[PDB]
Amino acid sequence: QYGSFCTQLNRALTGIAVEQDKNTQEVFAQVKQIYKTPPIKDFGGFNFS
Amino acid sequence: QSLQTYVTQQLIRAAEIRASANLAATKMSECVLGQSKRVDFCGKGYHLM
Amino acid sequence: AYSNNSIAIPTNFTISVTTEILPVSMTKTSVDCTMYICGDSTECSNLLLQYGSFCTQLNRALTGIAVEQDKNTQEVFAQVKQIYKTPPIKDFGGFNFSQILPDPSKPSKRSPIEDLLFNKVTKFNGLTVLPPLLTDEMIAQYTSALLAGTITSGWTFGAGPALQIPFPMQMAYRFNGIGVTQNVLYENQKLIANQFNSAIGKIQDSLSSTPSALGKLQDVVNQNAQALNTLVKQLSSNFGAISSVLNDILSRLDPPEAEVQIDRLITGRLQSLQTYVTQQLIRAAEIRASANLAATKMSECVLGQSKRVDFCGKGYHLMSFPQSAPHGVVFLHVTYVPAQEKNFTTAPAICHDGKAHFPREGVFVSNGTHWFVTQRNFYEPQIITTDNTFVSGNCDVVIGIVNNTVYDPLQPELDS
Amino acid sequence: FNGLTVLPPLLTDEMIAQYTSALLAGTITSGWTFGAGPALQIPFPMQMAYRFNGIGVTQNVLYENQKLIANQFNSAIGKIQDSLSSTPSALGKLQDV
Amino acid sequence: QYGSFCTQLNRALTGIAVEQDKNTQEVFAQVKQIYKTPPIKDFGGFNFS
Amino acid sequence: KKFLPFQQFGRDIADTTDAVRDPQTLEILDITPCSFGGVSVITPGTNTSNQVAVLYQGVNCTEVNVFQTRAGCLIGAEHVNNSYECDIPIGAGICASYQTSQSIIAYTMSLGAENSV
Ligand SMILES: *[C@@H]1O[C@H](CO)[C@@H](O[C@@H]2O[C@H](CO)[C@@H](O)[C@H](O)[C@H]2NC(C)=O)[C@H](O)[C@H]1NC(C)=O
Ligand SMILES: *[C@@H]1O[C@H](CO)[C@@H](O[C@@H]2O[C@H](CO)[C@@H](O)[C@H](O)[C@H]2NC(C)=O)[C@H](O)[C@H]1NC(C)=O
Ligand SMILES: *[C@@H]1O[C@H](CO)[C@@H](O[C@@H]2O[C@H](CO)[C@@H](O)[C@H](O)[C@H]2NC(C)=O)[C@H](O)[C@H]1NC(C)=O
Ligand SMILES: *[C@@H]1O[C@H](CO)[C@@H](O[C@@H]2O[C@H](CO)[C@@H](O)[C@H](O)[C@H]2NC(C)=O)[C@H](O)[C@H]1NC(C)=O
Ligand SMILES: *[C@@H]1O[C@H](CO)[C@@H](O[C@@H]2O[C@H](CO)[C@@H](O)[C@H](O)[C@H]2NC(C)=O)[C@H](O)[C@H]1NC(C)=O
Ligand SMILES: *[C@@H]1O[C@H](CO)[C@@H](O[C@@H]2O[C@H](CO)[C@@H](O)[C@H](O)[C@H]2NC(C)=O)[C@H](O)[C@H]1NC(C)=O
Ligand SMILES: *[C@@H]1O[C@H](CO)[C@@H](O)[C@H](O)[C@H]1NC(C)=O
Ligand SMILES: *[C@@H]1O[C@H](CO)[C@@H](O)[C@H](O)[C@H]1NC(C)=O
Ligand SMILES: *[C@@H]1O[C@H](CO)[C@@H](O)[C@H](O)[C@H]1NC(C)=O
Ligand SMILES: *[C@@H]1O[C@H](CO)[C@@H](O)[C@H](O)[C@H]1NC(C)=O
Ligand SMILES: *[C@@H]1O[C@H](CO)[C@@H](O)[C@H](O)[C@H]1NC(C)=O
């Protein structure tokens, strides 16, 4: 009897869940080429291990 | 009423997290992928990487 | 292919134009709280006044949103005080701007691209829509002035007065701002102009080809339409009352028990407006942030040359051209992308007389046997001379320093 | 179990680690070139020389002090491990969320 | 009988009040040390008084 | 419209009834809401003048020195051909101001002085 009061709450939370996956992608998926370092880690004395 | 209060809080909190995600994406584009000249954007001192 | 003595330097490049679409304003919807809840009903209105300023506060919040939407458009587009126009001369060094410049042979003078943007985007129970302060024609004039200033005056029209400059010479600045020497432009001007013209033509097809490109602007329209469609549908709900129609309760019940059923409708409908207004305020905050970002981008990428990575497209930013869009703005970002690269062996310094020589600009590279110095962003080998390198320290300190010879241009002048 | 469910993120933890590893590898081996265009290899101390000139310090300061700079960088990273694994309030922003 | 509805409202306003003090701390307390100008006002003709 | 003979009412995308069939005469009649809209008062500061102009939002100038605008019917403000900087926004490019003898005027706002490089 309350119409869309229930349904639109499900829609609102669904929008957040999609946005959360969007937020991760814009932050981390900024490369689109999986680069690898060389097997011999020799970077002029800089230790990145 | 309890759900509407909960959903509204989630919507407002999602906006804050989205702003942080946008800032994180901006930093990784500018702090990681480049060399930012913005003061204190990539920490104290003159940014290198 | 990392190693301690190998560097890759581009030998060629391409002009890429990317499209960034940002929403700027929402639909200026205004809702009459009294008419929505108690339309044409004096008795229902007398019950509404028992809730105090509930109705008035809801109207005030929507009014604040509507004023803000005009503010959002003003900051994004009205960043120029003078309306600049391009001359009838279109000699810009071979760069063809006719597809982003206003088309005068058509109603509502717009660019071919702007019309494509507009063609791809799609008052009842107290709900009306208010027109924006700036019409589409007025926004097109703002983008035309910003476009004309960028082409004919570079970034000078933003910082101050519009100082005319030949566009090829303007592009020479844009090269020098990303670390590529001016001569790369003039030697390759025909190639660069052709690549720019082809990229603009691709934008016309790309936006047209895929109909989901302008989804960012269509999402704003869809969400606002859904909010109002949900709002009207709530009028048919009973919320516990005998009938969603007020006239079917008053004329089917004595007032003493008719007010019990009507009190369930005012509560339901007033709560529906509060849900709608709260959603609009939250959505308006998102649009305001997008409008602030759009205003920032036009200030820093259209009125100047941003050095922020990925702020205005992949590659190295040069310049952007704004385009009008319904409920938003579209930026065309022109950048340099290095395209063809070769593996070169490199060295950090070179030993000539025991003294360490470092390049003032660029990096040392060897083509197997000969050593040269070239700019890092474009392969252009130069003979290593005292006018290209500076002296600091000696060869016993620098790690990886190699032996070669510096040509001194003054020695043969003195000998001859 | 009151109608409340949690959905898994689209990218898992090991997938985000791959993205960071790719960004880490590109930064170390190619500088800023992997972002703007293709990953152009460059020796790392040569890349630091570019980082020197971006802040107004002539690159010869690096090569003359390369051993000192590498040692100080290595020590600073080690301090990050100690500080993060000692202070129980450093990662408050993630815990507060 | 309405449960935590009262308590949640107090908590939300408390979070706002704490955020306001944080707002002033990031904007203004960007310098660790309190610098003062000398009694000499010879700044090349620039009047900062 | 041509309603099917059984159909007696017309419905909107939402729930509003737009069309109906008259019972006596079989002609079809479409309904429309009795006009309504907001009444904004356009005023300068009362410390300067007590003269005001009234804007009726989203209505014609027949249901209500009259200037018809897209934002609605404006009454009391004079229509001026000359453009100026926007002072009191009305909508659809129209702004109002109190200018010299003095009266409230309405005009299409100027976007700035034109120039050429
Ligand atoms: C980088 O530093 C790490 C330590 O921060 C070094 O790892 C050490 O390796 C030695 C073996 O040679 C072990 O005895 C130590 O216990 C290790 N320390 C840790 C914390 O793992 C590593 O040697 C350095 N990398 C290089 C290439 O020098
Ligand atoms: C850089 O690459 C472009 C291609 O993107 C080269 O231009 C092409 O050159 C070929 C000849 O080899 C022509 O057939 C094409 O018509 C050219 N295309 C365009 C768009 O002009 C360009 O010559 C290269 N530059 C350098 C210095 O190598
Ligand atoms: C800029 O490019 C447009 C095409 O994008 C050129 O206009 C074309 O001109 C040719 C020859 O007159 C016509 O056959 C085409 O129909 C035109 N195409 C379009 C889409 O208009 C235009 O001439 C170029 N500008 C300049 C000054 O050369
Ligand atoms: C490296 O570049 C140098 C300079 O361009 C090359 O030396 C020239 O080679 C040409 C033949 O292709 C001769 O005609 C010139 O007289 C040479 N100039 C000098 C100064 O020696 C050299 O061959 C190149 N080496 C490689 C491996 O590419
Ligand atoms: C670069 O050239 C210098 C001299 O111009 C070389 O220095 C010589 O080193 C060798 C072997 O260590 C000695 O036999 C010579 O006596 C040194 N020269 C002097 C002036 O004493 C240096 O080795 C060269 N670099 C390379 C790798 O060939
Ligand atoms: C900085 O400017 C202020 C005024 O802006 C100067 O203060 C004036 O000092 C004179 C004395 O020579 C007084 O007669 C004026 O009334 C002062 N004006 C004000 C507004 O205070 C001040 O002298 C300037 N600073 C210096 C060191 O020259
Ligand atoms: C450089 O050499 C690597 C091998 O280590 C190879 O994979 C790469 O394709 C080469 N680059 C060019 C431009 O030839
Ligand atoms: C570079 O690496 C090689 C190993 O492949 C090594 O022999 C050489 O000494 C290194 N040079 C420098 C300057 O680190
Ligand atoms: C506005 O009117 C007041 C009268 O209350 C007067 O004191 C004040 O000076 C006026 N200000 C202007 C700017 O006209
Ligand atoms: C209603 O307004 C329009 C302008 O949009 C006008 O053409 C029309 O004549 C008006 N209606 C009447 C009855 O005057
Ligand atoms: C504007 O000027 C035209 C003549 O070009 C005239 O017909 C019209 O009435 C004027 N409008 C106003 C509002 O003064």
UniProtKB/Swiss-Prot annotation, chain B:
Taxonomic lineage of the native organism: Viruses, Riboviria, Orthornavirae, Pisuviricota, Pisoniviricetes
Protein name: Spike protein S2'
Disulphide-bonded residues: 31-42
Gene name for this UniProt entry: S
Effect of residue 26 to I: In strain: Gamma/P.1
Function: Subunit of the fusion protein that is processed upon entry into the host cell. Mediates fusion of the virion and cellular membranes by functioning as a class I viral fusion protein. Contains a viral fusion peptide that is unmasked after S2 cleavage. This cleavage can occur at the cell membrane by host TMPRSS2 or during endocytosis by host CSTL. In either case, this triggers an extensive and irreversible conformational change that leads to fusion of the viral envelope with the cellular cytoplasmic membrane, releasing viral genomic RNA into the host cell cytoplasm.
Part of the whole protein covered: 1002 to 1050 of 1273
Curated annotation (Swiss-Prot), chain C:
Effect upon mutating residue 387 to H: In strain: Alpha/B.1.1.7
Superkingdom in the source lineage: Viruses
Residue ranges of the region described as Heptad repeat 1: 189-239
Glycosylated sites: 4, 12, 96, 343, 367, 403
Residues carrying the site annotation Cleavage: 110-111
Disulfide topology: 33-55, 38-44, 301-312, 351-395
Coiled coil regions, renumbered to chain: 218-262
Function: Precursor of the fusion protein processed in the biosynthesis of the S protein and the formation of virus particle. Mediates fusion of the virion and cellular membranes by functioning as a class I viral fusion protein. Contains two viral fusion peptides that are unmasked after cleavage. The S2/S2' cleavage occurs during virus entry at the cell membrane by host TMPRSS2 or during endocytosis by host CSTL.
Protein known as: Spike protein S2
Protein species of origin: Severe acute respiratory syndrome coronavirus 2
